[PDB]
Amino acid sequence: MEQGTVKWFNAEKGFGFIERENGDDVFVHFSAIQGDGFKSLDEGQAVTFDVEEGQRGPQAANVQKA
């Protein structure tokens, strides 16, 4: 059950940070978020994501709306 809260969204970058339970900001990508309607993450909103491996950080892929 991979739940996370949107910390802050780098709209001008096309990326964002979603907290893991230990505060570990997971790095989400524009092509990882389901940009249905709008391509942004509501800061403070809780969602789910399919976290993948990443050499330079946890890859927040396949973002599912809670």
Tab-separated table of N, CA and C in Angstrom, residues 2-59:
chain	number	residue	atom	x	y	z
A	2	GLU	N	1.240	1.693	-1.191
A	2	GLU	CA	2.198	2.776	-1.348
A	2	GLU	C	1.501	4.128	-1.373
A	3	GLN	N	1.222	4.650	-0.185
A	3	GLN	CA	0.587	5.951	-0.046
A	3	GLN	C	1.639	7.024	0.193
A	4	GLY	N	1.364	8.224	-0.281
A	4	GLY	CA	2.262	9.334	-0.059
A	4	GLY	C	1.546	10.663	-0.143
A	5	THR	N	2.074	11.663	0.535
A	5	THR	CA	1.495	12.992	0.496
A	5	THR	C	2.346	13.900	-0.384
A	6	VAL	N	1.702	14.668	-1.246
A	6	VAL	CA	2.415	15.601	-2.100
A	6	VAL	C	3.017	16.728	-1.269
A	7	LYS	N	4.341	16.750	-1.199
A	7	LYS	CA	5.063	17.776	-0.459
A	7	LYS	C	4.965	19.106	-1.191
A	8	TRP	N	5.613	19.170	-2.340
A	8	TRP	CA	5.581	20.349	-3.181
A	8	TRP	C	5.806	19.941	-4.629
A	9	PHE	N	5.214	20.687	-5.548
A	9	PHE	CA	5.237	20.311	-6.952
A	9	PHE	C	6.022	21.314	-7.788
A	10	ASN	N	7.070	20.826	-8.437
A	10	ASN	CA	7.869	21.643	-9.338
A	10	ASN	C	7.187	21.717	-10.695
A	11	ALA	N	6.166	22.556	-10.785
A	11	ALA	CA	5.378	22.687	-12.004
A	11	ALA	C	6.234	23.169	-13.167
A	12	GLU	N	7.166	24.069	-12.880
A	12	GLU	CA	8.036	24.626	-13.912
A	12	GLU	C	9.133	23.644	-14.310
A	13	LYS	N	9.282	22.581	-13.538
A	13	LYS	CA	10.250	21.541	-13.856
A	13	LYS	C	9.562	20.356	-14.522
A	14	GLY	N	8.328	20.100	-14.113
A	14	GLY	CA	7.616	18.928	-14.577
A	14	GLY	C	7.866	17.745	-13.668
A	15	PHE	N	8.215	18.038	-12.425
A	15	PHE	CA	8.522	17.009	-11.446
A	15	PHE	C	7.876	17.364	-10.115
A	16	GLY	N	7.956	16.461	-9.154
A	16	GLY	CA	7.395	16.734	-7.849
A	16	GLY	C	7.963	15.828	-6.781
A	17	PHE	N	7.704	16.169	-5.528
A	17	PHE	CA	8.175	15.372	-4.408
A	17	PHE	C	7.004	14.864	-3.581
A	18	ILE	N	6.891	13.552	-3.489
A	18	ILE	CA	5.850	12.923	-2.692
A	18	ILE	C	6.489	12.209	-1.508
A	19	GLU	N	6.055	12.528	-0.298
A	19	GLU	CA	6.702	11.993	0.893
A	19	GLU	C	6.401	10.510	1.073
A	20	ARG	N	7.411	9.770	1.491
A	20	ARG	CA	7.214	8.417	1.968
A	20	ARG	C	6.982	8.490	3.485
A	21	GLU	N	6.635	7.375	4.128
A	21	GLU	CA	6.248	7.393	5.543
A	21	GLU	C	7.366	7.929	6.446
A	22	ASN	N	8.607	7.849	5.979
A	22	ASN	CA	9.743	8.350	6.750
A	22	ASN	C	10.210	9.711	6.243
A	23	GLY	N	9.351	10.382	5.486
A	23	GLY	CA	9.664	11.716	5.004
A	23	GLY	C	10.574	11.703	3.791
A	24	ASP	N	10.916	10.514	3.322
A	24	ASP	CA	11.779	10.384	2.160
A	24	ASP	C	11.046	10.850	0.916
A	25	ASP	N	11.306	12.093	0.536
A	25	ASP	CA	10.743	12.670	-0.684
A	25	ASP	C	11.039	11.791	-1.893
A	26	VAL	N	9.988	11.223	-2.459
A	26	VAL	CA	10.095	10.421	-3.665
A	26	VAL	C	9.945	11.322	-4.890
A	27	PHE	N	10.803	11.122	-5.880
A	27	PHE	CA	10.866	12.007	-7.033
A	27	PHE	C	9.937	11.519	-8.143
A	28	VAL	N	8.858	12.255	-8.370
A	28	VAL	CA	7.888	11.889	-9.394
A	28	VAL	C	8.151	12.667	-10.683
A	29	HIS	N	7.786	12.069	-11.814
A	29	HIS	CA	8.057	12.659	-13.120
A	29	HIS	C	6.757	13.013	-13.840
A	30	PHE	N	6.852	13.929	-14.800
A	30	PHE	CA	5.698	14.370	-15.584
A	30	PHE	C	5.079	13.219	-16.379
A	31	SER	N	5.907	12.268	-16.789
A	31	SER	CA	5.435	11.127	-17.561
A	31	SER	C	5.137	9.952	-16.628
A	32	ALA	N	5.094	10.241	-15.336
A	32	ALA	CA	4.782	9.239	-14.333
A	32	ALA	C	3.441	9.547	-13.683
A	33	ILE	N	3.108	10.828	-13.647
A	33	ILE	CA	1.833	11.280	-13.115
A	33	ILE	C	0.743	11.101	-14.160
A	34	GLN	N	-0.432	10.649	-13.737
A	34	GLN	CA	-1.565	10.585	-14.640
A	34	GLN	C	-2.128	11.988	-14.853
A	35	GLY	N	-1.608	12.665	-15.871
A	35	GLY	CA	-2.036	14.015	-16.175
A	35	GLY	C	-3.404	14.046	-16.818
A	36	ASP	N	-4.394	13.568	-16.090
A	36	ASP	CA	-5.761	13.555	-16.573
A	36	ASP	C	-6.469	14.821	-16.122
A	37	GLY	N	-6.760	15.697	-17.072
A	37	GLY	CA	-7.376	16.966	-16.750
A	37	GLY	C	-6.345	18.062	-16.577
A	38	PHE	N	-5.422	17.852	-15.650
A	38	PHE	CA	-4.356	18.809	-15.395
A	38	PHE	C	-3.081	18.082	-14.993
A	39	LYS	N	-1.940	18.668	-15.323
A	39	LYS	CA	-0.654	18.075	-14.989
A	39	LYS	C	-0.048	18.781	-13.788
A	40	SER	N	-0.582	18.482	-12.614
A	40	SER	CA	-0.096	19.058	-11.372
A	40	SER	C	-0.477	18.164	-10.203
A	41	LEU	N	0.287	18.248	-9.128
A	41	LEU	CA	-0.044	17.539	-7.906
A	41	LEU	C	-0.445	18.539	-6.839
A	42	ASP	N	-1.612	18.339	-6.250
A	42	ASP	CA	-2.099	19.232	-5.213
A	42	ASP	C	-1.257	19.076	-3.956
A	43	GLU	N	-0.517	20.119	-3.621
A	43	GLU	CA	0.386	20.083	-2.482
A	43	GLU	C	-0.403	19.944	-1.186
A	44	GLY	N	-0.133	18.874	-0.453
A	44	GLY	CA	-0.888	18.581	0.748
A	44	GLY	C	-1.864	17.438	0.538
A	45	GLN	N	-2.076	17.076	-0.723
A	45	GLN	CA	-2.990	15.995	-1.075
A	45	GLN	C	-2.284	14.647	-0.960
A	46	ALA	N	-3.028	13.632	-0.554
A	46	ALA	CA	-2.483	12.292	-0.429
A	46	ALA	C	-2.866	11.448	-1.635
A	47	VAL	N	-1.899	10.715	-2.164
A	47	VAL	CA	-2.123	9.848	-3.315
A	47	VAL	C	-1.339	8.551	-3.167
A	48	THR	N	-1.398	7.718	-4.192
A	48	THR	CA	-0.657	6.468	-4.221
A	48	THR	C	0.213	6.417	-5.468
A	49	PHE	N	1.257	5.606	-5.450
A	49	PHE	CA	2.176	5.555	-6.579
A	49	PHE	C	2.923	4.230	-6.632
A	50	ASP	N	3.293	3.826	-7.835
A	50	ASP	CA	4.114	2.639	-8.021
A	50	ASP	C	5.587	3.030	-8.026
A	51	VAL	N	6.213	2.937	-6.863
A	51	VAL	CA	7.601	3.351	-6.707
A	51	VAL	C	8.551	2.349	-7.362
A	52	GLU	N	9.503	2.867	-8.119
A	52	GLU	CA	10.485	2.036	-8.790
A	52	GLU	C	11.886	2.387	-8.309
A	53	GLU	N	12.855	1.584	-8.719
A	53	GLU	CA	14.243	1.795	-8.340
A	53	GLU	C	14.826	3.005	-9.064
A	54	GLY	N	15.767	3.669	-8.413
A	54	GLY	CA	16.422	4.813	-9.006
A	54	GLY	C	17.798	5.038	-8.422
A	55	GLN	N	18.802	5.090	-9.287
A	55	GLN	CA	20.188	5.249	-8.862
A	55	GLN	C	20.393	6.570	-8.118
A	56	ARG	N	19.649	7.597	-8.509
A	56	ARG	CA	19.767	8.907	-7.878
A	56	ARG	C	18.492	9.294	-7.137
A	57	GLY	N	17.728	8.300	-6.705
A	57	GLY	CA	16.537	8.577	-5.931
A	57	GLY	C	15.382	7.681	-6.313
A	58	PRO	N	14.408	7.497	-5.412
A	58	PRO	CA	13.245	6.648	-5.670
A	58	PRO	C	12.363	7.227	-6.766
A	59	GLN	N	12.071	6.415	-7.766
A	59	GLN	CA	11.296	6.866	-8.904
A	59	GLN	C	9.810	6.678	-8.651
